[PDB]
Amino acid sequence: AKDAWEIPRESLRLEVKLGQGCFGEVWMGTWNGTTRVAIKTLKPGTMSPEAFLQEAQVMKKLRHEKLVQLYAVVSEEPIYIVMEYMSKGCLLDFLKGEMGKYLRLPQLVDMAAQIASGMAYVERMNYVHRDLRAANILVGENLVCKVADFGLARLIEFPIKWTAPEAALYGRFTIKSDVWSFGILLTELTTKGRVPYPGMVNREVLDQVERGYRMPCPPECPESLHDLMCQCWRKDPEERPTFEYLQAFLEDYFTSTEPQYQPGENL
Ligand SMILES: */C=C/C(=O)Nc1cccc(-c2c[nH]c3ncnc(OC)c23)c1
């Protein structure tokens, strides 16, 4: 028995590869002959069909302007998850590539504010994302940024570099472990997409972060924004800020917190 998200596969056409998802290719396509969509597919043997479809099931419950929106599901093999098309690709590639070279702090903080707004919704809905990072943010026209890849997201009831230590070690995933990941994402934004903890392997990251080590202020990043990162990286997850606070802080940043900001060479 199917629900009202289900469509027939013949209503989809797949034009062009957009890249590799976690478990199969993602394609740009059209739906019902007039809607541009993205279509996540499942590579054979990677994982079971319904484990793949848990991603679609979580997106059925989520609807916000800063989260990539589910459109439709084909729940018979070959499975397709059909969703909103984001024309500028993943944020990580955007930051690393030609276009991000001219991004400066006002645009980067505005992207962080949009991401914080989507995560504030996740927060209000009592969900956790667990895979928050620049590779899982998608960019659209006018530099809209949206939270994507809900493959691990879940109603509240792993790469150590982005994952809060209590989640990596003990599996304690809460919205505060996502707040930690958002702090790491802020470093990806202010370094034009560099890998966090440069020159450290995972085991060193784990040992050091447990000893109190935190990344220093990126070059030309204001101390006030590095302070925000350090708050997101507090050892005690309950001392980390809420996404509601991060959204407001970042939206108001250049009036309330850095009214004297001056452009630099890179930020
Ligand atoms: C950061 C690299 C990366 O993950 N790129 C990437 C892979 C697969 C798909 C996409 C992509 C691009 N536009 C999209 N719109 C909607 N959904 C997507 O994937 C789910 C999109 C980028």
Numbering used by the authors: 256 to 412, 424 to 533
Provide the authors' own sentences about this structure as they appear in the paper.
Ligand-induced EGFR receptor tyrosine kinase activation promotes downstream signaling which triggers cell proliferation and survival. Sensitizing mutations such as L858R or delE746_A750 in the EGFR kinase domain render the receptor constitutively activated, independent of an extracellular ligand-binding event. Acquired resistance to these targeted drugs is caused by a secondary mutation in EGFR (T790M) at the gatekeeper position that occurs in 60% of the patients, inducing steric hindrance to the first generation inhibitors and thereby preventing inhibitor binding. Herein, we present covalent inhibitors of the drug resistant gatekeeper mutant EGFR-L858R/T790M based on the pyrrolopyrimidine scaffold.
We synthesized compound 9, with no substitution in the 6-position, as well as compound 10a possessing a para-tolyl substituent. Using the established synthetic procedures, compound 14 was transformed into the desired unfunctionalized compound 9. Interestingly, both compounds showed an intense gain in potency at the biochemical level with an IC50 below 200 nM for 10a, and even more remarkably, below 100 nM for compound 9 against EGFR-L858R/T790M.
